[PDB]
Amino acid sequence: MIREGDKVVLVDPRGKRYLITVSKRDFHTDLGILKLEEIIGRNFGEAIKSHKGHEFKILRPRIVDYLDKMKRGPQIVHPKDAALIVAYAGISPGDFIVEAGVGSGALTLFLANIVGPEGRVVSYEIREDFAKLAWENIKWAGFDDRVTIKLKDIYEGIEEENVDHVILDLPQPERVVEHAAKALKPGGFFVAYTPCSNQVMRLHEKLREFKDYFMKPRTINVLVFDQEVKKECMRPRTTALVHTGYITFARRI
Amino acid sequence: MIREGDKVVLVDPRGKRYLITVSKRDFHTDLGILKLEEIIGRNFGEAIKSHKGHEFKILRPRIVDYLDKMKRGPQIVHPKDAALIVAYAGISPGDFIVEAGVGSGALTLFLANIVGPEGRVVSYEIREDFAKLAWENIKWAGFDDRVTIKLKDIYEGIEEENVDHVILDLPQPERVVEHAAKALKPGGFFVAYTPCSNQVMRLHEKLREFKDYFMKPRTINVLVFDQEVKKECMRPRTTALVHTGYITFARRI
Amino acid sequence: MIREGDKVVLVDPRGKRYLITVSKRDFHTDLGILKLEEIIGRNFGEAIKSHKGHEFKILRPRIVDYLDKMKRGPQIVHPKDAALIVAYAGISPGDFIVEAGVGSGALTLFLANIVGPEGRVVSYEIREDFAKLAWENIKWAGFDDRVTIKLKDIYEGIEEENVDHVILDLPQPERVVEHAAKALKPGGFFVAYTPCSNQVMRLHEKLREFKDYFMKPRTINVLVFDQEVKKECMRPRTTALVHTGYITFARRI
Amino acid sequence: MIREGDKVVLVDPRGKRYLITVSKRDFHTDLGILKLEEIIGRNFGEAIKSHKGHEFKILRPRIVDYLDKMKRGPQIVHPKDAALIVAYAGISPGDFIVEAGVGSGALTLFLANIVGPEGRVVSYEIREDFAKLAWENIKWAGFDDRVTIKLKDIYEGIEEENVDHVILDLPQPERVVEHAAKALKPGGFFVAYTPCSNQVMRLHEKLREFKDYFMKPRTINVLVFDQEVKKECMRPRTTALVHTGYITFARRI
Numbered sequence A, B, C, D: 001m002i003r004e005g006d007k008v009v010l011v012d013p014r015g016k017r018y019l020i021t022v023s024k025r026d027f028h029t030d031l032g033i034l035k036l037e038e039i040i041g042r043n044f045g046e047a048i049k050s051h052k053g054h055e056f057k058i059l060r061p062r063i064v065d066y067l068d069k070m071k072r073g074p075q076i077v078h079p080k081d082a083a084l085i086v087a088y089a090g091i092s093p094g095d096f097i098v099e100a101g102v103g104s105g106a107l108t109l110f111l112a113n114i115v116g117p118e119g120r121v122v123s124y125e126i127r128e129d130f131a132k133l134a135w136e137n138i139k140w141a142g143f144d145d146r147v148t149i150k151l152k153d154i155y156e157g158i159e160e161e162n163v164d165h166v167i168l169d170l171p172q173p174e175r176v177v178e179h180a181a182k183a184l185k186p187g188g189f190f191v192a193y194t195p196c197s198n199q200v201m202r203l204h205e206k207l208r209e210f211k212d213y214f215m216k217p218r219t220i221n222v223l224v225f226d227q228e229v230k231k232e233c234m235r236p237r238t239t240a241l242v243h244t245g246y247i248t249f250a251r252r253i
């Protein structure tokens, strides 16, 4: 069922994953040489063995795989932040999303997945090299069909109209507030990710100026604690990622 | 555009949301009486008035309104927990999900909206009053098309096959592990939400025993702090919801 | 034995405490009337019974009982914040402490307990009613031996010299930095408690300006989670106190 | 004023501290030889110079210095946890404390500082090399007067009686419960520090068997978030110490 050119997740015995394109070349590993040609005509769930006899399993790549293994220009918007943006903004299949700060394309890949083949994500970017690398990430993930990158400064305006969500992770989201109020559907969401307290203060004040266009804003911070579970001791993992950014939501009119 | 029988969200000046089916009747509010018939023939983004001069904005119902306004039992799975289920398990449009513990239909509604018209959710439930209640909400939210509620003890087995995700909020997820291993696609996710660390210990024991059926399980705990942001003062809100439940993820072999 | 005028802690069957003054007057309770005079001749570890038959145990009042049961114009600086102030700044028996913001006298009580009968806490306060209130609180607790309340505005200066610590919980702690710099012993701690980010920002501004007077400042934030532990279920408590204030520490060169 | 044999902290133009016993010798350091003969007869707040020009400040050793610079091999109980133990148990000058797990002496130092010259700390230990290292640390910090270490297993029993607090950092505190019930004064505190949920569950089980000797227990967990305050950005430190141990408190009768 797998043909040349298709993408595949190879899982080694230790649980390490390789998101691979099937082709006539021999992939090198910790644990021997895979001949990726042997994968043609196999099914997901079958295995291939390296030259030293270690078994690698073939999985269909999912969004988590693409997200986990893309070329990143550190940092990004993290899974957990993307998650709450989706939840509290209620992003849905079919939604039309404008986003600014395409970066590596991480938030874009996640949002593209949520809106499906019939949703649209339009990403703004001002940095040429980030646009060229994001686009390569989005083609690689197959979202080629639903995402458009505009090499354009969103501060100067939003061309689009009747958008479901404006989602931002750039330095000054306050400079987009006025444009978002025009672009957004009634009941549409303005969403911003900001690492600093200062950015929140500014944004909240701008959103107060635009009380007539937005509902009362909401700013959250998400923490995720991994648990270390064993036979005897169950306890939280000693260190954790405590802070990425704040997320501010505001409903339109 | 708005016709009889459609569902609409009315927003009052304060920002109180009313989820209403538009029909020929009068609706009684703390800001006076409304005639829903005046909504008919109008478009989203427009306003109707009350017999005290107070305006009511008309918005298209989004998933977040349904989750906010549905009938409930006591405990539920909160948006943040479902958010991370979605993010960490890679729940995508078109997915086939098995969930047990429908309860009030909160989680099921969340997942139904993520999977889209072409995804499917099958929910098991042992408690006949909950099943009726949950089904009441999904027809109401319009996910009629994609959701099926089984009145069946999931511990007896999972009749579905090639499922993308098995997602549990029930007292003993360990008693579903063997079943889910057979039901899940290669690469699919077992996901369990458990309030106590006892549950997690027991569940981790079962997954340990099924080592050759799942990758290394990870267990997480998610906290969300709201921020009180004023002109003079930005502090985290004094009080917060600090624990709902632990979430455990395991990918199938 | 216990005599008239002694202060005592009555613990009821449900574990509830009552800090009481022993005297010929009968005290009214959920569980019946207590003849407090019957607590004369009795000793710590003994009990007395209400007219409804219920037994109240007699304990020696400790610092936690005074802190837990005093008259507040709430909220105070919470015992979690005061603990970390003590621990991080090294507050020891015999210390000479200047604090400003006597308020209810809660912080003052805590530090007074720490410094001991031979230590000194000098508390500044600009409000006559608070000063009366707190002084009544500290008498009540037996600390009038070691605490001084100066009805004076600390922004105008600190009369004391060679102080161990300057501990602040007032709105503009930056206006005390210079005075604290000159009041503190070498190795003495400037400590401020500030509910808002904004206050931390200004206080960091001022401490940068006086870098030649202070080591690098450190701002913490402390959360305490309660656990629900029962035979079956052990989980963190659902709701917690998430924020009181930030605490900044600065060592004098 | 400062004579031979006394202890002194040296602060350099970076901020780093060195705690030494003052005696005539060319002290080897990163910024050049010190020669601690220029220091004798000086006062605190003065400066002494090396051969490379730079200046070193003389500070009086506080409890924070001893806890920083001590030989601290084995994992300590953390300052934040010591703090809440002090706070919630109401540990006061002059208290009599039995503690088990002397470890390196860290928790023993901190407690010995709080109970003061007239308090007593009896530390139990079963490991020789730990006991030798612990006694060598407390003598160095000057608490020889108030601390005794017993090379004896606390599970076998508690020799002392009428004690203020039993403070534990060992693997099975539930075995010390009955002994503590005998040793503690009316209103005294049993305090145990456990890194695992399991340990807490066992302990709570024992404490409830001893409901007639103890008030309902209270288990807590403390987190400290460091704040990053730069001129143009305030945010929490990205990473933070999230879990060290749970702490359980119970009042005797």
Ligand SMILES: Nc1ncnc2c1ncn2[C@@H]1O[C@H](CSCC[C@H](N)C(=O)O)[C@@H](O)[C@H]1O
Pocket: A100, A101, A102, A103, A104, A124, A125, A126, A127, A130, A152, A153, A154, A155, A169, A170, A171, A195
């Ligand atoms: N006005 C604008 N329009 C479109 N993209 C923008 C933009 N301003 C910035 N960007 C892009 O948005 C991305 C994130 S900017 C980096 C944000 C950083 N975490 C912070 O602390 O603020 C970058 O790729 C940047 O080039």
Ligand SMILES: Nc1ncnc2c1ncn2[C@@H]1O[C@H](CSCC[C@H](N)C(=O)O)[C@@H](O)[C@H]1O
Pocket: B100, B101, B102, B103, B104, B124, B125, B126, B127, B130, B152, B153, B154, B155, B169, B170, B171, B172, B193, B194, B195
């Ligand atoms: N074996 C089973 N099959 C299907 N549904 C079940 C089930 N056991 C419980 N449920 C349903 O799942 C929902 C949540 S059960 C309550 C969960 C609890 N907090 C715990 O984990 O301990 C209820 O609606 C209940 O009827």
Ligand SMILES: Nc1ncnc2c1ncn2[C@@H]1O[C@H](CSCC[C@H](N)C(=O)O)[C@@H](O)[C@H]1O
Pocket: C074, C075, C100, C101, C102, C103, C104, C124, C125, C126, C127, C130, C152, C153, C154, C155, C169, C170, C171
């Ligand atoms: N310059 C100053 N000198 C002395 N006390 C001051 C002061 N500024 C404020 N205070 C006192 O410090 C205390 C804390 S004020 C900050 C907390 C807040 N205003 C509240 O009341 O909850 C108050 O009792 C106030 O009267």
Ligand SMILES: Nc1ncnc2c1ncn2[C@@H]1O[C@H](CSCC[C@H](N)C(=O)O)[C@@H](O)[C@H]1O
Pocket: D074, D075, D100, D101, D102, D103, D104, D124, D125, D126, D127, D130, D152, D153, D154, D155, D169, D170, D171
């Ligand atoms: N019954 C007992 N009496 C006295 N000390 C004990 C004891 N059981 C354990 N200890 C000591 O208590 C301390 C903490 S024990 C828990 C930490 C971990 N097991 C470790 O050693 O790294 C150790 O110093 C240990 O030697």
